[PDB]
Structures are given as structure tokens and as C-alpha cells.
Design a binder for this molecule. Structure first.
Ligand SMILES: [Zn+2]
Lengths: 126, 124
């Protein structure tokens, strides 16, 4: 028997390790997904309030602070857009890791029944 | 008596399960995002209702109490939407759990249904 790599319990353990990683990451992907939804809504309302006061509540009143309120909204807008972008990027970093993980399981699971069979053989020798 | 179905029959049932897993994880993922949208909408509406009870100055007090009944109206409507989404998200996670069990169950029954067919290959 020419054994390639290692034993049937080395790879039962590498599968346990991947399944652990799958759990904690799916959880974080799920959470980010919900935080991405909060930001998109926030950003939606900010856009449609910068609209609703542009071009002279929602009454024009004192125009001499009504552009500090644009510098407020724009700041609250950009800051949110900045946040969102980092979360969208992290969400697909997680989706990449999960894909990587799913493949390694797909690879190892037949390699389990193969290391199962090499061991079954060495049983009949002795 | 052989296990009641064939490898080709259960290769097939696992494909139909995996198809279901895809479309439901997708819907789950989408609800997860819309729930976040509503949770933020509702946070702001609560924060805005308390912020006039406390520009956003005081002005008229006989149209600024129908703006509490339009905040409340926009608030309850959202809370109603959210509850149906939270409920539908866990019905999806229930299906997904069921699905994952079938796969976990039928995948050993695969190697067995073909282990039987491998035997019948040597009879004949
Ligand atoms: Zn006002």
C-alpha cells in the first residue's frame, strides 16, 4: 500500500475543522447581510432628504443655516457610504472563504472513504 | 428485499434537494437584508417620534399631532412588515435544516444503493 498524504483520522479532523470555520463565517455573512440592509436604508432616506430641502417640516425658513444641514447630511451620507463599501467588500471576502471551504470538503470527503479502504486492507494483512 | 430505490433514483433526489437549497438560501439572504432595512427604518421613526416630543423646533401644535399619527402609522406598518419577514426567515431556516438532514441521510444510502448494484454486477 502506497499511502498518499496521511491517515483516516487526520482527515476526519480536517473536515471537523472546516465545518467549524463554515459555521462561524456563515454567521458573520448573515450578520453583515443584515447590517448592509440597515445602511442601504439609512443612505436611502438621507438621499431623499437632501432632495426634499434642495432648491429653497420641509419649509424653506432661514436659508443661512439650511446649508449647514447639507454639510451635515453630506457628512452623514458619505460616512455611511464609506461604511457600506467596507461591509460589501467584507461580505464577498466571506463568500470567497465559504466557497474555498466548500470545495475542500468536496475534495476531502471521497478521500475519506479512500483512506477508509486503505485502512480496511491493512486490516486483512495482519 | 433491496432498499426500495436505485442509485439513479437517489442521485436524482439529491439533485432536487440541492436545487431547493440554492433557491432558499438566496431568499433567506435577501430577507436578511430587507430585515435590516426595516430595522433601521423603525429605529429612525422611534428616534424621530421621541425627538419632537422633546430644525425640529416646536411650532404649530395642531398639525404636529397628526404628524405623530402619521409617524405611528408609518411605524406600525413597518413593524407589521418586519414581523412577517422575521417569521418567513425562520420558515426558510427550517426548510434548510430539513433539507440538510435528507442530504445527510441519503448520502450514505447512496454508496449503499450502488454497493448493492456492484454486487448484482457479479451475479450476471
Ligand atoms: Zn422642521
Amino acid at each position: 500500500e502506497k499511502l498518499g498524504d496521511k491517515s483516516p483520522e487526520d482527515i476526519k479532523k480536517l473536515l471537523e475543522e472546516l465545518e467549524t470555520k463554515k459555521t462561524t463565517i456563515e454567521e458573520e455573512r448573515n450578520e453583515i447581510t443584515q447590517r448592509i440592509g440597515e445602511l442601504k436604508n439609512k443612505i436611502g432616506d438621507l438621499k431623499t432628504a437632501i432632495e426634499e430641502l434642495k432648491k429653497a417640516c420641509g419649509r424653506e425658513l432661514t436659508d443661512e443655516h439650511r446649508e449647514e444641514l447639507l454639510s451635515k447630511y453630506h457628512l452623514d451620507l458619505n460616512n455611511s457610504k464609506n461604511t457600506l463599501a467596507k461591509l460589501i467588500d467584507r461580505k464577498s471576502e466571506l463568500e470567497r472563504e465559504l466557497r474555498r471551504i466548500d470545495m475542500e470538503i468536496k475534495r476531502l470527503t471521497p478521500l475519506l472513504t479512500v483512506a477508509e479502504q486503505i485502512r480496511s486492507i491493512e486490516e486483512e494483512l495482519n
